[PDB]
Amino acid sequence: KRYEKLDFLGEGQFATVYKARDKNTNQIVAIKKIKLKDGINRTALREIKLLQELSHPNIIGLLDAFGHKSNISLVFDFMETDLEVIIKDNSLVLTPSHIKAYMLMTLQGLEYLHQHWILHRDLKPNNLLLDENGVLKLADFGLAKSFGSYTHQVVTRWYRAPELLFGARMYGVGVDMWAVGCILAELLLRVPFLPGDSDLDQLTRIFETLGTPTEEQWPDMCSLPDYVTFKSFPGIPLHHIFSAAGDDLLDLIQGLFLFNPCARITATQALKMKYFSNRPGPTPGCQLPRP
Amino acid sequence: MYHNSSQKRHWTFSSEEQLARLRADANRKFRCKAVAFLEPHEEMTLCKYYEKRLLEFCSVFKPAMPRSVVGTACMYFKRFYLNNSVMEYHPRIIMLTCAFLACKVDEFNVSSPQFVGNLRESPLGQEKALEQILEYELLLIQQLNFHLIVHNPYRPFEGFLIDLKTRYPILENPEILRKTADDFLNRIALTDAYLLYTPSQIALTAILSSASRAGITMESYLSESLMLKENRTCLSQLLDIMKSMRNLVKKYEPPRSEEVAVLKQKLERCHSAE
Amino acid sequence: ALYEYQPLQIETYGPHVPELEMLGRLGYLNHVRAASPQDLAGGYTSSLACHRALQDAFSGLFWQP
Numbered sequence: 001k002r003y004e005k006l007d008f009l010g011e012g013q014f015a016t017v018y019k020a021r022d023k024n025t026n027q028i029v030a031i032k033k034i035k036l037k038d039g040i041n042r043t044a045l046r047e048i049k050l051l052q053e054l055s056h057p058n059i060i061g062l063l064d065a066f067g068h069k070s071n072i073s074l075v076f077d078f079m080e081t082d083l084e085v086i087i088k089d090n091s092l093v094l095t096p097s098h099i100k101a102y103m104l105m106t107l108q109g110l111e112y113l114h115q116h117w118i119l120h121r122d123l124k125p126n127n128l129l130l131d132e133n134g135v136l137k138l139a140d141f142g143l144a145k146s147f148g149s150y151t152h153q154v155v156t157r158w159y160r161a162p163e164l165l166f167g168a169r170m171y172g173v174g175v176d177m178w179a180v181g182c183i184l185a186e187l188l189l190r191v192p193f194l195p196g197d198s199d200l201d202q203l204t205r206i207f208e209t210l211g212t213p214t215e216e217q218w219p220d221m222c223s224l225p226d227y228v229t230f231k232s233f234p235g236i237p238l239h240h241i242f243s244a245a246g247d248d249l250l251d252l253i254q255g256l257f258l259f260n261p262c263a264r265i266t267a268t269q270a271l272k273m274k275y276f277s278n279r280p281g282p283t284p285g286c287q288l289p290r291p
Numbered sequence: 292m293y294h295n296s297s298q299k300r301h302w303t304f305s306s307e308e309q310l311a312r313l314r315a316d317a318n319r320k321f322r323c324k325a326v327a328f329l330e331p332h333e334e335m336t337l338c339k340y341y342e343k344r345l346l347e348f349c350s351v352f353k354p355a356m357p358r359s360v361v362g363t364a365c366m367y368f369k370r371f372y373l374n375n376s377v378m379e380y381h382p383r384i385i386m387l388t389c390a391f392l393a394c395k396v397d398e399f400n401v402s403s404p405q406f407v408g409n410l411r412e413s414p415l416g417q418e419k420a421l422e423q424i425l426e427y428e429l430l431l432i433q434q435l436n437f438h439l440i441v442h443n444p445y446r447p448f449e450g451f452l453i454d455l456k457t458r459y460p461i462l463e464n465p466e467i468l469r470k471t472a473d474d475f476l477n478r479i480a481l482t483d484a485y486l487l488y489t490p491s492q493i494a495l496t497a498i499l500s501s502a503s504r505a506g507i508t509m510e511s512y513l514s515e516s517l518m519l520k521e522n523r524t525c526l527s528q529l530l531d532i533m534k535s536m537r538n539l540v541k542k543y544e545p546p547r548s549e550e551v552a553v554l555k556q557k558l559e560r561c562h563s564a565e
Numbered sequence: 566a567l568y569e570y571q572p573l574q575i576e577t578y579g580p581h582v583p584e585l586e587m588l589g590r591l592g593y594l595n596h597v598r599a600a601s602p603q604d605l606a607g608g609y610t611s612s613l614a615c616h617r618a619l620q621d622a623f624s625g626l627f628w629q630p
């Protein structure tokens with residue numbers, strides 16, 4: 001097209017991603033070149049249909065789409081970094097203000113997104129792209145879906161909420177909220193909070209670390225279709241897990257890891273929590289660490 | 292959401308004079324390319340006829356295709372032929388590509404083989420049609436301008452019924468309106484209205500048309516429940532918008548069978564040359 | 566440099582939409598399907614469905630091209 005292909009940024013299941021320049025502007029873009037009698041791949045049509053209806057600073061902008069026949073290339077702005085790389089950077093310190101800023105943008109993007117009746121369903125640190133002005137964008141809307149009208153397989157396992165793991169068809173923002181919870185835990189612990197190798201082992205580590213739920217905690221848990229009773233764990237007190245976390249952040253984390261996804265704080269409720277309004281400012285995007 | 296949609300922004304036109312213009316343009320622009328012939332009213336008669344064809348396709352689709360797919364398909368077919376001639380892209384084919392894209396965008400997961408299993412042909416025809424559908428799927432999408440989410444009136448319609456059941460016991464059972472307001476949404480769908488007014492306005496006009504058709508004047512719903520006593524010009528802007536829709540369903544005449552047969556023969560001919 | 570929650574002030578060009586938590590209080594949830602126990606345990610409520618239906622009814626009702 002009008003695009004120069006600079007760099008292979010990576011490849012995963014549905015697309016190869018290239019850093020590319022339009023022969024039209026100074027602005028670098030990220031072209032996601034989507035791979036194959038189905039017609040144009042649904043994960044591309046998913047990003048096209050959603051990102052054309054979302055206009056928020058904390059959601060990735062679709063710039064263009066082009067292609068030929070059943071192949072397509074979605075063009076997005078290039079994001080220099082992502083939250084996974086920030087979390088994994090061993091020589092980069094996550095001050096509480098950095099953590100608050102990342103969380104704030106994530107929740108603002110999510111609030112907008114949930115207001116527009118969409119779930120990302122694939123929040124994890126690598127899908128939280130940072131532009132070079134330090135605006136975190138939600139990105140990789142390839143699993144994102146409209147709610148308030150699904151499937152349990154969604155969200156990469158370490159961020160997958162227990163209601164997803166118990167086979168919940170229907171869900172709402174709590175799948176994103178638990179994933180925010182997990183991303184928050186990993187901004188704190190600097191490693192996967194619940195790195196479980198299977199649906200069974202993810203539920204085990206959930207119940208090991210946070211305590212096994214009850215019907216006092218999660219009213220109709222037992223009605224989830226892939227439910228099985230775990231042994232009662234005590235859980236590890238959230239101040240023994242997150243010993244740097246203040247009571248406000250633990251109150252956040254607590255509400256982000258509430259077993260009842262109904263009780264689990266929404267992006268709006270989370271944003272109204274005292275954590276965000278308290279004395280350490282959420283860092284300006286300009287001053288977030290570039291890894 | 293509609294109020295910040297690409298539909299509102301780009302696909303709800305200021306009047307039918309702007310519609311007629313985009314169409315009359317594209318007929319001329321076809322001729323300018325083709326010389327480097329149906330008249331615009333004849334393209335319109337055919338697009339009316341093939342939007343009927345799209346509706347029949349979507350209505351018999353063997354995995355039960357949702358109204359929000361069918362409405363999205365029909366909307367893609369209205370938007371396509373605003374800016375493209377039926378003499379460049381054969382409406383028969385583009386209708387399938389409309390349904391196809393709409394199945395995918397509305398998340399109605401149906402594989403290509405059982406998509407074309409619905410076509411009333413031989414399997415060679417089904418394969419050839421599938422191949423044409425896949426030939427035009429990106430074309431369609433480029434001509435829809437990558438504005439793929441279509442706000443149908445049907446969810447707005449559910450919300451007004453919830454709102455009426457809750458807040459307007461003047462209309463004791465609102466659900467009695469459902470049939471004739473659906474029939475009126477179906478009639479509004481054949482018109483230009485989808486390109487001219489909002490999904491909520493269409494939904495409310497359909498409700499108030501069914502209300503009026505039952506003799507139940509719901510003026511107090513508009514003034515009192517919707518709070519347009521506060522702003523009576525917004526009440527009259529609303530009433531004007533709804534008046535004009537009832538006039539669109541009034542002025543709409545179906546394409547005649549005997550007429551469409553001539554225009555079809557012309558269309559086939561425009562496609563067999565060139 | 567503190568944050569303060571300010572809602573999104575997206576203009577809907579439509580009637581006032583009754584807040585999600587008020588829908589039961591205001592009696593709108595009498596007119597939508599109750600979310601079943603599996604729905605509820607997944608975090609899906611009758612209020613989500615209701616709220617979106619009402620949001621869509623009202624959105625762009627007053628808007629002129």
Ligand SMILES: CC1(C)CC[C@H](Nc2ncc(C(F)(F)F)c(-c3c[nH]c4c(P(C)(C)=O)c(C#N)ccc34)n2)CN1
Nearest residue numbers: 009010011012017030076077078079080081082085139
């Ligand atoms: C290594 C870093 C941190 C610095 C470059 C990269 N910059 C960037 N800018 C924009 C986009 C967007 F969002 F615009 F595409 C994307 C992108 C999004 N999905 C991707 C994938 P996948 C295949 C997981 O979808 C892979 C893989 N592998 C690679 C890149 C992307 N990346 C992000 N990673």
